[PDB]
Amino acid sequence: LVTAIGQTEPIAFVHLKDTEVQRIEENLEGVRRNMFCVKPLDLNLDRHANTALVNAVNKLVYTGRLIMNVR
Amino acid sequence: MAAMEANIFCTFDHKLSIADVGKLTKLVAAVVPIPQRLHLIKHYQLGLHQFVDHTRGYVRLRGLLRNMTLTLMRRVEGNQILLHVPTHGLLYTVLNTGPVTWEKGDALCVLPPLFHGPLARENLLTLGQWELVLPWIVPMPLALEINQRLLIMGLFSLDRSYEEVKAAVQQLQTITFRDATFTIPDPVIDQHLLIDMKTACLSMSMVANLASELTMTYVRKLALEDSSMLLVKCQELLMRLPARPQHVSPDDEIARLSALFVMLRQLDDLIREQVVFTVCDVSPDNKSATCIFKG
C-alpha cells in the first residue's frame, strides 16, 4: 500500500472477476445517468471466493461507492 | 493433641494359630489401610473387611477405601503388629499381595480386589468369623480401565432390555490385560454410580459446546487426503456424515481450547485414581518392588 504523502488510496474492489468488475461499474454509471432510480440490485459476489473480511468489505464498499455517487 | 502417629500397633485379642502367625511374616511390607488412625487400633477396625455389605457394591468399596489412610506393614512378632505411614515423597519398599507383573517406572494405585477366577483365596487368614482383606495394588493402565468399564456398564444398562445387559456385562467384566485374566465381583448399579454417571453425563454435553467448529470437523476432513491405519479403524465408529474455514479468530480460538481442557480434567479424573506409588527397579522375583510418592 502507498505510504507517500499526498497519495490517498483510491477506492477499489479487491480480488474480483472482470465480468463482475466492469459490469457493476455500469450500475454505478446509472446513478450519474438517472439518480431518481437507485437500487442495490447487484448481489453476485460469492463467499466461496477470498475470505471473511475481503468479501464483507466489498458489500460495504458498494454502499460507499453509491453514497458518494448519489451525492 | 499429638499429630496422628506415624507408628501404629495392632494387637489381636483372638488367639492366633501357629500356622497363621507365619502367614503375617510373609505379609510384611504391604499396604494395610486403616480408618480410625489410633495409636493402638484394634484388629476389628483393621483391613477392608468391616466395609463389606450385602449389596457388595464394588463401586461402593472403590470410594470408601480411598478415605482410609494407607499403612505399610512392619515388624511382625509375637502377637504384635506395627503398621507405619511413610511421609510424602520419601522412598520405601512395597510387596505386592496381588498377582500382577509390575513394570519399571510406572505409577500405581490402590484398588479393591478382583477375584482371579478360581478364587482359591490362599489360606485367606481368618479368625472369629472374620477375614483380613487387603486391597490390591495395580498398574495405571489396569487401574484406569477398571473404572471406565464400571461406567460404560452403567450407560448400557440404561435404555435397554435387562436380558441384553447380561450380554454386555459378560464381555465387560472380563479383563485380559497384561497376560493374567481378571473379573469384577458384583458390579451392582448404585447411586454412587448415579453421581459418577452424572459428572460424566455433564461433561458429555459441555465438551460438545466448547469444541471449536474447526476441531470436531477436523477428523472428517483429514480423510480427504491422508490415509492411515488409525484413521480407518476410528472412522468406522463415527456416523457416516477444497473448502474455506467459516472463520478464523486466533484470540477467540485459543480461548475455546483453554476452557475445553478443564472439562476434560473434570471428565478424565473419574477414571483416574490418586496415584500412590512410582516404582523404579522392580525386584527379579516380582514379589516386591521399591516405591516413592507414597500417601
Binding site: - | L158, D159, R160, S161, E164
Partner: protein, 71 residues
C-alpha cells in the same frame, strides 16, 4: 410430493419428542422405532420413498400400541 413431504418432515420428529416424555413399561424397546424415526432423511431418489414411509409407519403404529398397552 415434496410440499406434503415437508409437512411430513415436521410432523415426523415432532412425534419423537412426545415419546421421550411418555413412560413405557419397557424402556429399551421404545427407542428401536424412535431411533429410526430420528434417522429420517429424504434422498433425491423418489424410488425409495415407498420404502421411506414404510419404516416411518413401522415406527408409528407399533409405538402407538405401546401407549394403549394393547399387545
Amino acid at each position: 410430493l415434496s410440499s406434503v413431504l415437508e409437512e411430513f418432515e415436521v410432523r415426523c420428529v415432532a412425534v419423537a419428542r412426545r415419546g421421550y416424555t411418555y413412560p413405557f413399561g419397557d424402556r429399551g424397546k421404545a427407542r428401536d422405532h424412535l431411533a429410526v424415526l430420528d434417522r429420517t432423511e429424504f434422498d433425491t431418489d423418489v424410488r425409495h420413498d415407498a420404502e421411506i414411509v414404510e419404516r416411518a409407519l413401522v415406527s408409528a403404529v407399533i409405538l402407538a400400541k405401546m401407549s394403549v398397552r394393547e399387545t
